[PDB]
Scaffold this active site. Structure first.
Site, short mmCIF file in Angstrom:
data_model
loop_
_atom_site.label_atom_id
_atom_site.label_comp_id
_atom_site.label_asym_id
_atom_site.label_seq_id
_atom_site.Cartn_x
_atom_site.Cartn_y
_atom_site.Cartn_z
CE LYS A 44 -4.31 1.12 2.42
NZ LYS A 44 -5.56 0.37 2.75
NE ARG A 101 -2.85 0.60 -3.69
CZ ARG A 101 -3.80 1.35 -3.13
NH1 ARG A 101 -4.21 2.49 -3.68
NH2 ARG A 101 -4.32 0.98 -1.98
CG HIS A 133 3.09 7.60 0.02
ND1 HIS A 133 2.66 8.91 0.15
CD2 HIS A 133 2.23 6.85 0.75
CE1 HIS A 133 1.60 8.95 0.93
NE2 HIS A 133 1.33 7.71 1.32
CE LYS A 161 -4.49 9.88 0.90
NZ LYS A 161 -3.69 8.65 1.10
N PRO A 162 -7.87 14.17 -0.66
CG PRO A 162 -8.60 14.88 1.47
CD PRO A 162 -8.51 13.68 0.57
CB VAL A 163 -3.09 16.31 0.80
CG1 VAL A 163 -3.78 17.67 0.86
CG2 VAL A 163 -3.25 15.58 2.13
CG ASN A 164 -0.75 10.49 -2.21
OD1 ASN A 164 -0.94 9.90 -1.16
ND2 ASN A 164 0.00 10.00 -3.17
CB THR A 165 3.60 13.44 -0.44
OG1 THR A 165 2.98 14.60 0.12
CG2 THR A 165 5.05 13.79 -0.78
CE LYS A 216 2.42 16.39 10.10
NZ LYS A 216 2.11 16.58 8.67
NE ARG A 238 -1.64 21.88 -0.46
CZ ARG A 238 -0.85 22.84 0.04
NH1 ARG A 238 -1.25 24.11 0.12
NH2 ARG A 238 0.38 22.52 0.46
CG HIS A 263 2.09 7.14 7.95
ND1 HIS A 263 0.76 7.50 7.86
CD2 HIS A 263 2.72 8.15 8.60
CE1 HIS A 263 0.60 8.69 8.42
NE2 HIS A 263 1.77 9.10 8.88
CG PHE A 264 4.82 10.89 3.06
CD1 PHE A 264 4.38 12.19 3.25
CD2 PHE A 264 6.07 10.68 2.47
CE1 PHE A 264 5.16 13.27 2.87
CE2 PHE A 264 6.86 11.75 2.09
CZ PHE A 264 6.40 13.05 2.29
CG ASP A 265 3.71 11.60 10.28
OD1 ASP A 265 2.61 11.00 10.29
OD2 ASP A 265 4.11 12.33 11.21
#
Ligand SMILES: [Pd+2]
Length: 124
Positions: A7, A10, A12, A41-45, A66, A85, A119-121
């Site tokens: 996940k 896929r 990040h 999805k509101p925000v992804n990096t 966080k 964004r 996870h991307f924090d």
């Protein structure tokens, strides 16, 4: 049963290019990676680096997540990322994205054996 680690890949990892050379990029990529199947999805990096590099971060600078957990790590050097964004005129299912490029340190959360990102924090 997609693994959190798969996940993470896929959602990040994009090693395939070293920078988001386009403003199309996010539109395409957010859709390509199924980040627009339930909703926009509101925000992804997305991180333009080798998988080993990004996985190596899991034994770099331990920092508070966080959410108050201790399993986050910050990259020692900066990495090529692309913030996606969501715009104002983005309406599901026509999800539209302002692409943005930068070189920032990344922070990720890792877990598991082997110990890898799930996870991307944040970018800093
Ligand atoms: Pd620095």
């Amino acid at each position: 049963k997609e693994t959190a680690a798969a996940k993470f890949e896929r959602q990040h990892m994009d090693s395939s290019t070293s920078a988001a050379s386009s403003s199309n990029y996010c539109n395409q990529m957010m859709k390509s990676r199924n980040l627009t199947k339930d909703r926009c999805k509101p925000v992804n990096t997305f991180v333009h680096e080798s998988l080993a590099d990004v996985q190596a971060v899991c034994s770099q600078k331990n920092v508070a997540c966080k959410n108050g957990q201790t399993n986050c790590y910050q990259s020692y050097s900066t990495m090529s990322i692309t913030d996606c964004r969501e715009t104002g005129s983005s309406k599901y299912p026509n999800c539209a994205y302002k692409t943005t490029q930068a070189n920032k340190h990344i922070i990720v959360a890792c877990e598991g054996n082997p110990y890898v990102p799930v996870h991307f924090d944040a970018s800093v």
